Curated annotation (Swiss-Prot), chains A, B:
It is found in: Cytoplasm. GO terms for biological process: canonical glycolysis; gluconeogenesis; glyceraldehyde-3-phosphate biosynthetic process; glycerol catabolic process; glycolytic process; methylglyoxal biosynthetic process. The gene is TPI1. Its main location: cytoplasm. It comes from the Eukaryota. This is Triosephosphate isomerase. Changing residue 94 to N: Reduces activity 5000-fold. Triosephosphate isomerase is an extremely efficient metabolic enzyme that catalyzes the interconversion between dihydroxyacetone phosphate (DHAP) and D-glyceraldehyde-3-phosphate (G3P) in glycolysis and gluconeogenesis. CDD domains: TIM (cd00311). One of its GO terms (cellular component) is cytosol. Substrate binds at residues 10, 12. It comes from Gallus gallus (Chicken). Pfam families: TIM (PF00121).
Length: 247, 247
């Protein structure tokens, strides 16, 4: 009945074998809550390395992939390759790929469908920007993005939604736990009416804003926040505290 | 005085540990010419693996990277990471990155600057599309792309230009050895007047069109073709014949 708490740690473009080696060794020896499903999002070049060194209980995620198994797409990797090195997840639709690299809702949706058909789990990301949040069209934007994902999801048991308050990234604005709860609650209500009641009750909607050891207990105590997609703090030893945010 | 023959092998988005393992085993046991600099362009998730398995005499190249060492750029790898796993090259501005993923001349120039400063070698790719070749403005296009790269190159000794006749990629048209020589010759002349004569005589300008064991002998015998950037044929054992194109 209860959704399993889910902390993913998006490392982004960071680290080398030495620094990521020390990070992994710290997670391996740390007292982690058995209630939490932990997943580390490693750079593509370090996905094989991260899987070898990390304990089997902690999952590994690609930070991005493409929509077909093979082909003339220099620079890209496919779900077939991510599966081949032992990883079981992929992060798609991150705000950074949307913004810096112009990834459309259509393109993200194709990636979601393919990743899922190949047997990977997907951490799908959504979120509205500053001018959108200020305009009061938060719901219209995240529902548009969630629909572009959901049209390509037949089975929700391998999917986790991640809300990114992009409006509070790099601008003077900040997100409160109450504001996060209000978006998560509306996303769950969207899944209830557009997919099914059971999908809404079992699907983890994790918060992907600024999550630190100092603010995670309050964000996790929110009814409809089922975990985090942690940015910068996933590289530090306090990522352990964030995993244990309910204890 | 002569420019060392340079055969790079762009694997693109293809293969797994098993298939790439057999590929690498064939190249390691093959009778490769000492006069040919061989470099394998592996997918990012298999870069580490490729460097370990491949003999030291064959270089390893990333198929793409970003313009800073670290940062909030989910899904991207940096030159510092490529250097960390033992690779010494990177393929930038590939036609597929330009067309499918909208990589601009500016972004490519920024990437080239960073890659060279971090100590990597660069196979920079340029080429005119069908509508540009048809309009007769081939010179104007490849001079623009080469300039965007040259403005960000301080030292050309670690750089290799790869001409990609994109107008002959899936259009039904094919580039003849005379037509390849015609572009390569004009590119070397561009380097002569816009940089220096010494740079023009020492810089390898390799052919990035469709290269097989059937057509490489005639292409390589052209005066200003100094090697190849091989596509599909770099996965198969005939890549050995292409490496030995002059013998």
């Amino acid at each position: 009945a209860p959704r399993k708490f889910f902390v993913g740690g998006n490392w982004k473009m960071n680290g080398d074998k030495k620094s990521l080696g020390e990070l992994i060794h710290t997670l391996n020896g740390a007292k982690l809550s058995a209630d939490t499903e932990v997943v580390c999002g490693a750079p593509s070049i370090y996905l094989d390395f991260a899987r070898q060194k990390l304990d089997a209980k902690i999952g590994v995620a690609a930070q991005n992939c493409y929509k077909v198994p093979k082909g003339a797409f220099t620079g890209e990797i496919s779900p077939a390759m991510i599966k081949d090195i032992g990883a079981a997840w992929v992060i798609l639709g991150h705000s950074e790929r949307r913004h810096v690299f112009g990834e459309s809702d259509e393109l993200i949706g194709q990636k979601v469908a393919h990743a899922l058909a190949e047997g990977l789990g997907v951490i799908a990301c959504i979120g509205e920007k500053l001018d959108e949040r200020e305009a009061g069209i938060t719901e219209k934007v995240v529902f548009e993005q969630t629909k572009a994902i959901a049209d390509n999801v037949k089975d929700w048991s391998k999917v986790v939604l991640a809300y990114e308050p992009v409006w509070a990234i790099g601008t003077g604005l900040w997100a409160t736990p109450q504001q996060a709860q209000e978006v998560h609650e509306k996303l769950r209500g969207w899944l209830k009416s557009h997919v099914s009641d059971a999908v809404a009750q079992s699907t983890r909607i994790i918060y992907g804003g600024s999550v630190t050891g100092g603010n995670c207990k309050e964000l996790a105590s929110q009814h409809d926040v089922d975990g985090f997609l942690v940015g910068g703090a996933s590289l530090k030893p306090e990522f352990v505290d964030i995993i244990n945010a309910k204890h």
